[PDB]
Amino acid sequence: LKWIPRNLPSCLINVESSVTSVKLHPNLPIVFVATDHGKLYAFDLFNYTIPLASLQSHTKAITSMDVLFTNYTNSSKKNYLVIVTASKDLQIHVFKWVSEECKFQQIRSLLGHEHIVSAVKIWQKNNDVHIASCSRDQTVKIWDFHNGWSLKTFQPHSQWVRSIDVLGDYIISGSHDTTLRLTHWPSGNGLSVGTGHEFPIEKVKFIHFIEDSPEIRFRTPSTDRYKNWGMQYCVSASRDRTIKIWEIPLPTLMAHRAPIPNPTDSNFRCVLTLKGHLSWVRDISIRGQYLFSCADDKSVRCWDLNTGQCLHVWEKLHTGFVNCLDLDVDFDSNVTPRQMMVTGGLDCKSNVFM
């Protein structure tokens, strides 16, 4: 099942003001947009122009949205029923999604960060038992979903934490100190600090059903079959204008417990650096065969990490900066219906690409 990532936009959805995050629903043909309004809107992406629902209750600006992504089929079916959001009012609001495609109620407001919350995520591995968030604080926080309690607070970076992406046991953070960290969620220890970005990191995504990506670069250079299948990976997007690929078992950061422990506390292990287009990279996604990305260069770009080439550019996508994109996850019977990407800009629009 190969795919099409292109055309001229076959839906353009008017939005109030600046789009901050765009996010697909797991099960239903509906997609959700967050903005500086401070509001969440809902659209059917199959049909247009569709004014399905609006959500109000944040004070200042909504900067991230999650609860849609899931780590399993059964978790999917139960998970798409909540929505979590992030804001510049220092709130993490928890919403209730209804079968009629809207949110009829806010369930919780969670308080505990002292500045701008700029990302939020549900822990899909735990069946929506916990929420992660990050902030201008310099802080990452973990919250009980069903009590609203703050349960773990990581203290890591010396500057603004911009993003948090979770993979069950592990936590990927990204920040203004030019650094990506991977922290172990149960202990609070950091396995990795990925150092070598030149400017602020805005973004992270983990790699999925495509650990066939080693074909391009083999790590360690020797005796691969011992530990090559155990490699976990992520991507960072930055104000560098560059996108990096990291495998994480070998850019583990040392704290120096002896001295230098092999290439640990050396240069980063970073697999590929994709050098492309013309402004700050706001987003980054794994398709499988390809990587997708968006940036302040008014553009959404398709990257072939086979040969490092950028195989297509959709630069007229927005007339201002592009803040976020989302791809639709392939699944049996839904193959062709999951043919979309959604994208949101500073030109106050959410756009559907087939």
Side-chain angles (χ1 to χ4, degrees):
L1 304 166
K2 293 180 177 180
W3 245 343
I4 214 172
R6 52 168 197 176
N7 305 342
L8 175 71
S10 295
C11 173
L12 288 79
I13 298 170
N14 298 326
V15 185
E16 182 93 23
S17 196
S18 192
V19 180
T20 325
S21 69
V22 191
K23 188 76 76 168
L24 176 82
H25 202 263
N27 184 63
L28 291 183
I30 62 180
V31 167
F32 296 101
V33 179
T35 57
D36 62 345
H37 189 157
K39 293 279 288 278
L40 323 148
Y41 285 81
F43 294 91
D44 194 343
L45 287 185
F46 185 74
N47 293 301
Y48 55 96
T49 297
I50 300 300
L52 176 60
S54 77
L55 299 176
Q56 57 192 31
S57 64
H58 283 280
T59 298
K60 289 186 177 176
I62 301 175
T63 44
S64 271
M65 175 192 282
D66 207 63
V67 185
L68 303 169
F69 290 98
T70 182
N71 204 36
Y72 192 51
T73 301
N74 292 340
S75 182
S76 192
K77 295 175 180 180
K78 296 181 176 180
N79 184 69
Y80 66 68
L81 298 182
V82 166
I83 291 308
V84 76
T85 66
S87 69
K88 294 192 173 172
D89 17 312
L90 291 47
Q91 307 287 265
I92 307 190
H93 289 184
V94 178
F95 291 95
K96 187 174 176 180
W97 180 86
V98 301
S99 51
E100 301 176 350
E101 297 190 341
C102 73
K103 283 69 149 170
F104 183 77
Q105 185 179 8
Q106 186 187 342
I107 304 162
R108 230 153 303 212
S109 189
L110 286 68
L111 178 60
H113 296 287
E114 293 186 1
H115 201 116
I116 298 161
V117 194
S118 28
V120 70
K121 190 165 176 203
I122 264 67
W123 296 73
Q124 307 99 343
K125 182 64 179 178
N126 292 307
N127 302 313
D128 198 4
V129 172
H130 296 291
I131 308 228
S133 53
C134 64
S135 162
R136 256 243 204 175
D137 267 58
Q138 308 175 4
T139 294
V140 173
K141 278 167 176 278
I142 305 300
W143 315 79
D144 183 341
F145 182 77
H146 288 288
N147 292 299
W149 296 341
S150 189
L151 295 179
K152 283 152 179 273
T153 303
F154 307 88
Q155 291 296 279
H157 315 95
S158 61
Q159 297 294 313
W160 191 353
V161 194
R162 296 234 116 218
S163 183
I164 183 156
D165 199 333
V166 322
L167 187 64
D169 294 338
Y170 301 100
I171 236 60
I172 309 163
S173 72
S175 57
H176 186 78
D177 53 304
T178 74
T179 252
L180 181 145
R181 300 194 176 196
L182 185 75
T183 290
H184 187 249
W185 183 73
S187 73
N189 296 321
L191 294 173
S192 67
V193 179
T195 50
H197 258 302
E198 294 177 5
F199 294 99
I201 297 169
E202 277 230 16
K203 183 66 171 71
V204 61
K205 182 67 196 64
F206 60 96
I207 292 191
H208 299 280
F209 300 95
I210 193 73
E211 304 173 348
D212 299 332
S213 84
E215 177 180 3
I216 302 300
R217 293 296 184 270
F218 291 97
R219 302 192 174 260
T220 47
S222 188
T223 313
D224 294 28
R225 293 180 178 172
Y226 184 75
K227 63 181 183 179
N228 185 284
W229 62 274
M231 292 190 291
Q232 295 294 300
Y233 300 89
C234 68
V235 303
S236 52
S238 180
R239 303 195 181 162
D240 282 56
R241 309 170 174 189
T242 74
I243 289 182
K244 297 194 187 323
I245 305 302
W246 320 65
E247 174 258 347
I248 297 296
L250 301 170
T252 54
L253 184 76
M254 218 68 171
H256 300 292
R257 300 178 175 79
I260 305 171
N262 326 315
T264 327
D265 203 72
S266 191
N267 299 322
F268 56 77
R269 192 67 183 158
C270 185
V271 190
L272 301 175
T273 291
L274 321 180
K275 188 176 181 180
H277 325 215
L278 305 168
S279 201
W280 301 351
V281 198
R282 300 304 233 82
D283 200 310
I284 208 173
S285 282
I286 298 300
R287 185 207 173 283
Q289 299 158 355
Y290 295 96
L291 179 159
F292 289 93
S293 91
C294 78
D296 284 354
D297 37 79
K298 348 196 228 116
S299 180
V300 175
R301 323 118 156 219
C302 187
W303 297 85
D304 193 6
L305 277 61
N306 198 334
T307 302
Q309 67 185 356
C310 179
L311 187 55
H312 198 270
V313 56
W314 188 249
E315 189 185 353
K316 284 185 178 177
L317 186 147
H318 282 146
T319 48
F321 316 143
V322 197
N323 290 277
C324 181
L325 59 153
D326 209 19
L327 296 168
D328 193 355
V329 178
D330 200 355
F331 185 71
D332 296 344
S333 301
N334 289 300
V335 188
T336 305
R338 300 275 191 186
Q339 186 185 309
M340 55 197 68
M341 65 183 75
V342 223
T343 268
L346 181 58
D347 60 323
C348 320
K349 293 184 182 179
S350 183
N351 293 347
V352 201
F353 294 87
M354 288 183 70

